[PDB]
Design a protein around this ligand. Sequence first.
Ligand SMILES: Cc1cc2nc3c(=O)[nH]c(=O)nc-3n(C[C@H](O)[C@H](O)[C@H](O)COP(=O)(O)O)c2cc1C
Ligand SMILES: Cc1cc2nc3c(=O)[nH]c(=O)nc-3n(C[C@H](O)[C@H](O)[C@H](O)COP(=O)(O)O)c2cc1C
Ligand SMILES: O=C(O)c1[nH]c(=O)[nH]c(=O)c1[N+](=O)[O-]
Ligand SMILES: O=C(O)c1[nH]c(=O)[nH]c(=O)c1[N+](=O)[O-]
Lengths: 307, 308
Amino acid sequence: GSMSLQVNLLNNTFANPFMNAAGVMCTTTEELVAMTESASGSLVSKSCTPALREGNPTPRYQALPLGSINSMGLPNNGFDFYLAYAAEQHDYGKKPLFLSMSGLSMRENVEMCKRLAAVATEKGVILELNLSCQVAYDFDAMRQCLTAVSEVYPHSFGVKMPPYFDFAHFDAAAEILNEFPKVQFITCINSIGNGLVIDAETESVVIKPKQGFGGLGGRYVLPTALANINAFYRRCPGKLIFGCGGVYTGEDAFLHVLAGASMVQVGTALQEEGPSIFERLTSELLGVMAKKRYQTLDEFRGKVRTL
Amino acid sequence: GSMSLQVNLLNNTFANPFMNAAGVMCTTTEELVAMTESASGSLVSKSCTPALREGNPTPRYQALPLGSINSMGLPNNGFDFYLAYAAEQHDYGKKPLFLSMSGLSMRENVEMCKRLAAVATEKGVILELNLSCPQVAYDFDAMRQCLTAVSEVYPHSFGVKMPPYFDFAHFDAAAEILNEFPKVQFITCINSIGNGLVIDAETESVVIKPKQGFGGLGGRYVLPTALANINAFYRRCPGKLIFGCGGVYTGEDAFLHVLAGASMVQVGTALQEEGPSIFERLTSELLGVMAKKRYQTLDEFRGKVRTL
Ligand SMILES: Cc1cc2nc3c(=O)[nH]c(=O)nc-3n(C[C@H](O)[C@H](O)[C@H](O)COP(=O)(O)O)c2cc1C
Ligand SMILES: Cc1cc2nc3c(=O)[nH]c(=O)nc-3n(C[C@H](O)[C@H](O)[C@H](O)COP(=O)(O)O)c2cc1C
Ligand SMILES: O=C(O)c1[nH]c(=O)[nH]c(=O)c1[N+](=O)[O-]
Ligand SMILES: O=C(O)c1[nH]c(=O)[nH]c(=O)c1[N+](=O)[O-]
């Protein structure tokens, strides 16, 4: 049986659906290069602000048996850096590039988008707009953010969404997203926000910022991620869903795709394993498909059976 | 060292902080009796509606390696039934009783509370008002109005069962509302992480029937969210007690709930999977944890989680 993890979307061809989750292993040149050199089908740069940010005091990330918790504080090299990477450095012959943007205000997103436009046009970098860096838990702030970006940014882009936890919210968020035809992918999900990990041995939290509260990733978040992927897969039929959350194995990735994911992003697992993980994941996902007699992702994407 | 899991709150003494989570093993008489006969410090009856509800088509619960997912649909024997249990059958000599209430409207809650009042007065049953039934607690206006309406007609302290929140803006907003109501003397954090979707890779299907497979997550999945909420509310509602609920499988998990601020610790998924004998193991495990850590009482470390 001939098989393929190839994905075609956004006027690009991807060798496989895998890419890093924004913020994981994608902050520095070396990381971006490592992601480019990896087996991943794509990569996305660390969510950027107009200027570099040191981020939060450490420890600000902690790997856990069931995932991770982090309150990084948006450390990044600043927009110029990621723009320059996209404009001059990235080898688009190897794989497409997503640039994650997380302006701390509408104005910042507008100004970065205005500059990104030309690089997107010339080089084909694709914006993933981080709406979940809060913003998308305020549907008005979300609408305004998307409106502003859509107004100034003359390309399709995607949005990185925080998880929602009820249909009213799935419906409200989809309704808004569907109002913006430039939003051509939706990445579900960012962390499950503000969990609190307590180490029983130390009787303390495990990250320093925010009294130990931080975003959960990893095994914790898989059913929430699947819920969100599928929810928006159903509710935004005009749009692609990128899955993100709880992917450690080809099998997990298979679940993302069944739920409706086109690309599958890997955060916590990648953080722990390094970009070699993509060789394992592609292999595993092919293995899963082989055992299940699938040849292409199209054959089961979004086809999760309900009862 | 002499150690105690005793908890004292709302004019009651509890042998230990453990109780079932509302909805787990507390729907029928047999279940309520078993929970009463168990080693638990307390119990709470299945969230009730004014009339019986058969709930959702099955399968509507699935135990999972990392917890559970359910969309039960509020199956319950109806308020009269739980009121009768509280009025006539429950052995208060054994342990205090909580009655979970989940009217589908403000009016329903008001009408039940009107009737619950006398029984609370007479027998000392304590209301846990479910504001997170699959959503009042994700609508702050509704929440305030609901608490106002209930507070108007219910002349007793009670607690509220909250859904998890996921940011400080919501912890603040929720806490601000709850702090407006002095009758709200405890807050139970948390109900399920709502509307997860479990997909069985083997069957390529969801695992519960209602709502296209979407359902509330419990168990290991939810512990850091539960701890976050417990602690968030513990911090923001200093005049209230927090009951922890979410992801408790061991005395160590319970120790974490208490460290985060919990007074009572509710056990849902783990209890579903192990039955009420779990309470002997949990009390034993928590005591063991405390002995190792040189704590004698829950007071000593409740809410004392160290930040960096
Ligand atoms: C250390 C770390 C940094 C992250 N940085 C970003 C980021 O910059 N932008 C973003 O949209 N998400 C960021 N995330 C969230 C991830 O992109 C992903 O949504 C989340 O971790 C769930 O995926 P996982 O379960 O594979 O970890 C970060 C997560 C981690 C753990
Ligand atoms: C089968 C089942 C039924 C439940 N029924 C109720 C209920 O009637 N009222 C309520 O407030 N919560 C209900 N819950 C939520 C639990 O009370 C608890 O908030 C949640 O499961 C998290 O606890 P856990 O991790 O120990 O399962 C139910 C949960 C399960 C799994
Ligand atoms: O703190 C982070 O960098 C972070 N952590 C996350 O888990 N998700 C994010 O979106 C972000 N962010 O700021 O873009
Ligand atoms: O569907 C349930 O019974 C259920 N399941 C939960 O996980 N939480 C609830 O509050 C409720 N409820 O209706 O009261």
